Amino acid sequence: AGHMKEFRPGDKVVLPPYGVGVVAGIAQRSVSGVSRAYYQVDFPGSRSKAYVPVEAPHSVGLRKALAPEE
Template identity: 30%
Template sequence: MTKSKKNEFRPNDFIVYPAHGVGQIMSIEEQEVAGLKLELFVISFEKDKMTLRVPTNKATDIGMRQLSSPDVISRAMTTLKGKAKVKRAMWSRRAQEYEQKINSGDLIAIAEVVRDLHRNDDQREQSYSERQLYEAALERLTREVAAVSGGDEVAAAKQVDEVLLSRAA
């Protein structure tokens, strides 16, 4: 294992874990599992009241990453402004694609889901599953925007909302 990979993440860093979004590394601990010593990142997802232990040598392989740069955040905002791209595929197929994008941990892909599933007041209603996917994507996007800009989720939600509303005008 290369030293640089291990030092990429440190305690107190905010990170993005593909399947769960933004978390914070609380510590690095050693545990013995099946007779082997394992070094683990202890990651807290405060909003979900969840703690995850990830082997330090597997973190990058599973897609754990640093928070996006401000540049990526602005690209995500630009993505939100775009026109919704809705394929004519069956909903089950599209839902699967949206879910994969949300769990990819890729902020631009998540922004695409928010863009494609966003509804204005005058548009048809969303189905329950559309709403669930939309809210999951919106939450991931908002949390990362908040973490990058210093942690105010209310301000981040307002920022995302304004971009979505400006698109409608």
């Protein structure tokens, strides 16, 4: 089980159309008169970022990546 956070900074995650990204930190955005936390993602080759909701991070299609062993 968890506690409050799910996605940690530097954790290898999949986010299309890029296919791979890394979380940077919890950035709270001011929208609808309410501050909401969003995982600031960063991808190589550009400065593009995707603000993933902390309430439903799997709803957008965010999953944990995996690497081989050998």
